[PDB]
Design a protein around this ligand. Structure first.
Ligand SMILES: C[C@@H](Nc1nc2c(cnn2C2CCCC2)c(=O)[nH]1)c1ccc(Cl)cc1
Ligand SMILES: C[C@@H](Nc1nc2c(cnn2C2CCCC2)c(=O)[nH]1)c1ccc(Cl)cc1
Ligand SMILES: [Mg+2]
Ligand SMILES: [Mg+2]
Ligand SMILES: [Zn+2]
Ligand SMILES: [Zn+2]
Lengths: 326, 322
């Protein structure tokens, strides 16, 4: 008959390889089954002898350790892993990367925002939170996510790596750490430049060129909302701003500095996205497109449209303002 | 006992100081004097009781490891003290930088569990798992340091503007994380890159010098008189074994320089003095020529003595093997 929801129709399994996938349709159960399938379909369960019963418990534990913030919640976790999935196929990555690196990318994506409390490192630092004091103002959140991720994998029951050798686990841990830490936006400028310097003369042989490439990929996935179709990506803005406004109120209310780009009184749906798209997103994917030309049409495409769409929407917001003292 | 004689106050200014004489109370009184004397109490409006409570707390948070203990904390601080006088650093550094150097020396090894980062990672400990195999101890010590300065009754910085706190916090973090011996190679190279054409007005050149200075004070046991320095080597190995004994009975790797069966007092130090201590102090002497005769001098002697002793240790094995 109609089977249960956590059994995916081949139609789903098919549509899950795509960035056009609607992340909003599904509920935890199914997102978890979705992710679980990702690990079989990518040959990770086979090639690392992952216990399939462990793989489920891992994902339940991962889900539980994500918090219910407006933005930095399990669905974001899902989007990023799903987008990494989408790009494994789009960029034929399984050719260019070892199965270990694929495992790192996927596992990294999933774990990258674990137990995120809802307020960025600038709050953590300026408010001198336990986490800021603990990690000494060095990417405290990302360091924290990373820590949480491996606390989980240290449990025998959640340890998807339990049947990996120690030399392999070492190498995987080192890689996830690198990537998760790379999600810090303070380091965007820095990482983009290092990447852009290797792109002068890229070399898939070179381990350091590849490390950057992975860092770039996970960053691409971390902020990829606007690559998704307008209908899927429009509400995320309200989720982001809901969280960013939570922090700015708290910051105001505790006498702490307040970033203009998170200010309830200044930011509008459009002004949030235009600059972010034009100058962070596009230039990033522009470089990735050089390594992978197919990315232009799938990813830059929606971004240009989303740019245009918001740039206009801002003209109208401003036209309206102007009218209300004209 | 409680009060320091003016002889002692005098002696404290030199590396010749006998760290072994004093009990904790008196070392705290010594450390206390360093703060008034260097003019930190004055120039940062430190409440004089808070400075005492803080030092007491800092002491509460050092453990009784045979080596990485409060007295090591005292050795390193008191050596830094000595280096301000010997190198006349008060002319080359602001009082903030002095505050950082001192306060960082003191805190640099807080709550050291007795087993190095190499164990922390390999055993995959709480610390290693939390700090992501990234200077986990040195991160920890640092964090502990500010958990203390966060208590308002121990807050020697309570009357410093938030701007300065920030610059001290940064200073202090950089220096504590620099003590990690994994980065010895890196940091020494970074420094010699600058020494090609050093510049006291280049905050970057100084941030590196401060590092080399605290680094210097961390490992500077053999710079002291033989009577003073030799007890530490037993203390060091006591610790280093305690770890390899644990490393062995948990199936984890042991490095041969802590392997109870390969290591002697002499082999431990000949290498260290030669390729770590001397080279570092050779460069620091290009900036401060006075150093050679006060620091490189006893080091060469120690090297020469332990090399002599190694000849005798080896001769004994020519009577033992079968
Ligand atoms: C207002 C905000 N816009 C924005 N921020 C996004 C998006 C996705 N992730 N992020 C943030 C969440 C933390 C990682 C960057 C997105 O689609 N838009 C923004 C943040 C930083 C800058 Cl520099 C500019 C705009
Ligand atoms: C065996 C050990 N010798 C040694 N190690 C020392 C000393 C002082 N601190 N340290 C270590 C203890 C942790 C802070 C560096 C010292 O006087 N001798 C050693 C360690 C590393 C190398 Cl490369 C060579 C010898
Ligand atoms: Mg994050
Ligand atoms: Mg240390
Ligand atoms: Zn994220
Ligand atoms: Zn030390």
């Amino acid at each position: 008959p109609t089977y249960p929801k956590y059994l995916l129709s081949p139609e789903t399994i098919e549509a899950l390889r795509k960035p056009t996938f609607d992340v909003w349709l599904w509920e935890p159960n199914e997102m978890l089954s979705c992710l679980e399938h990702m690990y079989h379909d990518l040959g990770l369960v086979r090639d690392f002898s992952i216990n399939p019963v462990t793989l489920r418990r891992w994902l339940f534990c991962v889900h539980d350790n994500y918090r219910n913030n407006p933005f930095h919640n399990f669905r974001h976790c899902f989007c990023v892993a799903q987008m990494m999935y989408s790009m494994v196929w789009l960029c034929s990555l399984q050719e260019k990367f070892s199965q270990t690196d694929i495992l790192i990318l996927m596992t990294a994506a999933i774990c990258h925002d674990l137990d995120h409390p809802g307020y960025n490192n600038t709050y953590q630092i300026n408010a001198r939170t336990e986490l800021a004091v603990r990690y000494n103002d060095i990417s405290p959140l990302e360091n924290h996510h990373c820590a949480v991720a491996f606390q989980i994998l240290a449990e025998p029951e959640c340890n998807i790596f339990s049947n990996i050798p120690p030399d392999g686990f070492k190498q995987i841990r080192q890689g996830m750490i690198t990537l998760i830490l790379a999600t810090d936006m303070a380091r965007h400028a820095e990482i983009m430049d290092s990447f852009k310097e290797k792109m002068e003369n890229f070399d898939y042989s070179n381990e350091e060129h590849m490390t950057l490439l992975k860092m770039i990929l996970i960053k691409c996935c971390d902020i990829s909302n606007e690559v998704r179709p307008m209908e899927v990506a429009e509400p995320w803005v309200d989720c982001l701003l809901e969280e960013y406004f939570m922090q700015s109120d708290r910051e105001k209310s505790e006498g702490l500095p307040v970033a203009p780009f998170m200010d309830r009184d200044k930011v509008t749906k459009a002004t949030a996205q235009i600059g972010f798209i034009k100058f962070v997103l596009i230039p990033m994917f522009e470089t990735v497109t050089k390594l992978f030309p197919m990315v232009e049409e799938i990813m830059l495409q929606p971004l240009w449209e989303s740019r245009d769409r918001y740039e206009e929407l801002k003209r109208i917001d401003d036209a309206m303002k102007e009218l209300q003292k004209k």
